[PDB]
A paper describes a structure:
Sco [name] is a homolog of Mycobacteria tuberculosis (Mtb) GlgE. In Mtb, GlgE is part of a biosynthetic pathway that generates α-glucans from trehalose and is a genetically validated anti-TB target. GlgE enzymes polymerize maltose-1-phosphate (M1P) to linear α-(1→4) glucans, Figure 3A. In these studies, we used Sco [name]-[name], which possesses the same active site topology and active site residues as Mtb GlgE; however, Sco [name]-[name] is more stable and is highly amenable to structural studies.
Author numbering:
A (entry chain B), B (entry chain A): 15 to 663
């Protein structure tokens, strides 16, 4: 009982944890299945990929090619359809027609064994014809058999008849396959399209108040949705919406002690008004939330709720479930840290005393918000909770509600970010904000779209309430434009935190990535109408970007991405493709200085010969340009951060 | 039911084919088991490797360490004992005592929480005490427990009682391990030492004849073994010893037609005088072979036989089992090709008509030679036979006779060479002869001793009857010296084909790696006594080298090898280590010109601080040197090809 089959087929990728967790995909996504495929001796091998939908049904005949000569690595692109658990195998086989055609091309003109090789071809095309099921496809192949056998013709003419394109036609359709060897099935999990594609917008409802009641409510915040929808966003992510604690409530600018009307951080979940299943009374009731969810849905927006599995000391859990916390010998509970940060206002959950209780409560809490229209959750700080916990929770929820998308806010070491993705988290936050040079971007994106894409889906938020990167601080408005062009086109999921559009870039101090006067500890009213009137918002650019994404399916995917070399360190170029769609992007990473460069396009990667002109259209400017293997660009920051171009039919 | 455990243990290496084939080792070989290990939050993890011999017995406590900061990859070295099928797991755990000690060294001198931190520690040394079952070890920790709780002692003095190395012992002996998580078992296959370590000598028995009878016999050839054993070799590899066919027998110098007395290629196995189970009658009988095998053993030599699963057209199989061959439509059998080489004198075995029959006969043939003392098989050209055939045959033979070593002569693409190693082949031929620059050699060895060492064991033949590399052609005798030093110290198994020691370097043509007047097609008599008197043999160095290997266990293993930088392309340097043994080698790859260089030793890789003296002894000259972090060397071709140095304590 051998491990290797008749024709070796080994290391079928994609693979997640040696095959005991599923590789990932979404409806309509293309990705490449691959395998090492070879045989003993010198004869030709073929390989093909077999996709199975969740019922057993196989996909189209999908043949593979050797991906680089002499490597015996083969690949083919396959595409997932209906959501569910799929499977895929690679089949390998002896390819006798390629083997024979190769030998007949040398032996027949050399006059070697011409009578034997031609009868070999007759017998073998006859065999190819026994499986071809079309009467026309059959009779075509069998004519070549007779032409091979016609001794009244020169051998060169008899052989020629087995290589006419009408024979390659019938043969490409129904190939003759010897010694068919299958790999073991590998699991694929196909999820709804939002798992991979979508633009996210984060805002605090409490900041969208009125002059007479400054603390916003769901009813006042619902009026901010039209602006957000108009910018072309699909998901609206809310920070925790529940009662905020008062004990050790932080004051403005992350000061330890609050004051009389300091609002405190929404992540300090819990107070005697309720816990994670309740609404913060200054936002309104559970019906105010439904109104919000409904108004969001009407505009085409999906609500994503923040799940922070933690408590403020006033959460009812603190006394209702003391065993969900770790108490020091004096009975106090150390406040949470994500060092060097201190979270004095909240308690970390301990998991080893009553793991069943936390599991049951977590899914109850989540099913509660599920019942009210929440189908997406931004999981706060998952890497401080056990990995097997999220695995079990995501399984419970998805076993009944497979459409529920979880996003992992895991800024941490590469191991944990990867593991959390592989155990269930549909999307992941990334290091995107700390990749700002051409080389950092190229490296990270080469990886995220490389092998990582079989278990991770990146959500490129260009800012969060906790990350005001120095690139944006020092670059001003042209920095905010470049980073949005970058996030919206390098990932099929990107996002911004409210105030990005207004280019809010004042840090708490220098060397800090915190915001001065951070929204986390204060209401942050913003004059959206003034900013729009005065043109001091890049909301126009954010909108056209999500427009480009919605008209260009190349931008709705991640794995098909290629960087093109340019002769300036500050100028990056790259293209993505989906079928006939080819988007092509050139960004000036200098926020401060005009750059000009030669972008030397890798023409075959766009599907073109080395010398062809390319009709492109700069979807930001609407202008049209004619490019070739080398192209002069000039990008003036403030005027034009980048060209975002579709190739024209 | 989750995939990930409480404390994650992930991607445990070494692994072969996702765990469906065993990793390899030999009795007494050291190698590193490694794993990705981490946890949620900021407390410490520990991990250990649990190696199990074939009855289950677990090995010594083997704790692991993070291999680089922030990588979450952990490793520990394990050592194999008895032959058999072993298994190994990694356990990971929360390390609460390491976390507390970390907090106690910071908080206690600052005077922060001293009464709580000290009580946290007492309660926890109390917990380590419930697992120590000895009456004495318990009170040891409990005295630290009582001193930690001692209200009337200085805080610095209470902490000290939990940190005495007298307590570090009883804890390293019985560690407090929380939430112990295991990986699933991985299989390890431990083979006898000769599979990894040993020197080979290949020669043709028929070339050791008498003046009156030029075709040697086993009885005359047995007389050549004293020279071979004395040269320090362990294995004697004989080309096929069976009847040679006459149909299409090749003549001298690989000419297509023989003459009246051309002996033919020994690989043209088979005639009506017998096939693979029979002895070539010009060699003597099966009793002469017994005599030869027995006389070889007396000298400390093991016989390795060539197994070539193929036939001359006069083999009895050609008519007894036509189905083991591939027939053209007229019933003839195309002669074997390995393009561009043509082997007109032999037919390849075809495997798809009667695979059980070929298997049964194959293991029948091998058990015959096993019955006559042959426990090693050099499998000729395995990559022209199906991979699964070798898997099933090697499993079968080793299933009854686990000591039988197979060596695969597969010079081909890397995929095939890897798979044959992974399916059973104890040793592999390598690309060694085509790696002659410092960068080629370093690249290849970094690969062979890196991850490849978990499934392949290299046999560094510096020449074969089929590979006289141009390096040896153009370099002459100093080239032959350099490659022997290189082969004998870079691999624990190396070999030479007889005539190497006489520096036979005359090729078929320019641009060929074939031998002129190949022993493959003609008796090649050699005046061994004359060459030694005339000093035209490098047998002294071969002998010196094999002695150095036998006194220095660093040269009897493969994986511990490290390259040291030198400032001349032509001077390579490296060291190997096995326990206290450190061999350090500096070779001049220039065969024609004296090279001088500064060898800049990587002192930690030798186990020293950058300022230490290193007493070495040049095992080739007997000279003694005091070396350091940087060393000037001068190597003259002809006089000194290399330093091969042992370190002294
Ligand atoms: O829940 C903690 C939490 C985790 C998130 N993780 C960071 C760490 C890596 C860099 C970027 C994200 C973010 O801090 C943010 O979502 C959140 O913190 C906020 O809430 C706390 C509770 O009130 C306050 O104590 C704290 O000051 C305030 O910032
Ligand atoms: O057995 C096949 C074969 C393969 C081995 N593989 C080589 C080829 C690639 C580069 C170096 C290793 C070696 O050639 C050698 O063992 C063998 O060849 C010999 O056997 C044939 C049958 O008698 C003769 O026709 C031929 O003249 C003679 O040389």
């Amino acid at each position: 009982p051998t491990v290797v089959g008749r024709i070796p087929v080994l290391d079928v990728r994609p693979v997640v944890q040696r095959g005991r967790r599923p590789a990932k995909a979404v409806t309509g996504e293309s990705f490449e299945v691959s395998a090492t495929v070879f045989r003993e001796g010198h004869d030709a091998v073929g390989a093909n990929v077999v996709l199975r939908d969740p019922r057993g049904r196989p996909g189209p005949w999908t043949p593979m090619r050797e991906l680089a000569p002499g490597t015996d690595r083969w690949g083919a692109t396959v595409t997932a359809g209906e959501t569910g658990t799929w499977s895929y195998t690679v089949e390998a086989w002896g390819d006798p027609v390629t083997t024979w055609r190769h030998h007949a091309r040398i032996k027949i003109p050399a006059g070697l064994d011409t009578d034997l090789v031609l009868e070999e071809g007759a017998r073998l095309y006859e065999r190819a014809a026994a499986d071809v099921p079309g009467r026309e496809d059959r009779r075509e192949l069998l004519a070549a058999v007779d032409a091979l056998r016609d001794e009244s013709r020169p051998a060169a003419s008899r052989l020629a008849a087995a290589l006419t394109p009408q024979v390659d036609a019938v043969l490409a359709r129904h190939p003759l396959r010897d010694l068919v060897t299958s790999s073991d099935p590998l699991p694929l999990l196909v999820e709804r399209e939002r798992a991979l594609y979508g633009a996210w917008y984060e805002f605090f409802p409490r900041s969208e108040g009125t002059p007479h009641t400054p603390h916003g409510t769901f009813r006042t915040a619902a009026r901010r949705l039209p602006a957000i929808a108009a910018m072309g966003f699909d998901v609206v992510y809310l920070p925790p919406i529940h009662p905020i604690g008062t004990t050790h409530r932080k004051g403005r600018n992350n000061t330890l002690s609050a004051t009389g009307d300091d609002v405190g951080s929404p992540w300090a979940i819990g107070s005697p008004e309720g816990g994670h299943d309740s609404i913060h009374p200054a936002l309104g009731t559970l019906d105010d939330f439904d109104h919000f969810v409904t108004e969001a849905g009407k505009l085409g927006l999906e609500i994503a709720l923040d799940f922070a599995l933690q408590c403020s000391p006033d959460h009812p859990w603190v006394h209702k479930h003391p065993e969900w916390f770790h108490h020091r010998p004096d009975g106090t509970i150390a406040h949470a840290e994500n060092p060097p940060k201190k979270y004095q206002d909240i308690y970390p959950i301990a998991f080893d005393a009553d793991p069943d209780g936390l599991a049951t409560e977590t899914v109850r809490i989540l099913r509660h918000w599920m019942d009210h229209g929440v189908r997406i959750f931004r999981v706060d700080n998952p890497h401080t909770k056990p990995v097997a916990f999220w695995e079990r929770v995501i399984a419970d929820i998805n076993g009944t509600d497979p459409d529920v998308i979880f996003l992992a806010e895991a800024f941490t070491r590469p191991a944990m970010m990867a593991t959390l993705a592989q155990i269930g988290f549909q999307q992941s936050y990334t290091y995107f904000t700390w990749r700002n040079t051409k080389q950092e971007l190229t490296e990270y994106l080469t990886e995220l779209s490389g092998e990582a894409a079989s278990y991770m889906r990146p959500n490129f938020f260009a800012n969060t309430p906790d990350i005001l990167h120095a690139y944006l601080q020092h670059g001003g408005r042209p920095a905010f434009e470049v980073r949005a062009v970058l996030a919206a086109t390098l990932s099929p999921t990107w996002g911004i935190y409210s105030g990005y559009e207004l280019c809010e870039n004042t840090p708490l101090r220098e060397g800090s990535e915190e915001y001065l006067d951070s929204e986390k500890y204060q209401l942050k009213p913003r004059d959206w109408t003034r900013a729009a009137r005065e043109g001091t918002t890049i909301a126009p650019l954010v909108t056209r970007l999500n427009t480009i994404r919605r008209e260009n399916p190349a931008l709705r995917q991640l794995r098909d991405l290629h960087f093109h070399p340019t002769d300036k360190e500050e100028v990056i170029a790259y293209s993505k493709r989906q079928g006939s769609n080819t988007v092509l992007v050139v960004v000036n990473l200098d926020p401060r200085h005009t750059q000009e460069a030669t972008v030397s396009l890798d023409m075959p990667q766009l599907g073109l010969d080395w010398h062809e002109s390319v009709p492109v259209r700069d979807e930001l400017t609407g202008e049209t340009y004619h490019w070739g293997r080398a192209n002069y660009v000039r990008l003036e920051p403030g005027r034009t951060p980048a060209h975002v171009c579709t190739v024209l039919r």
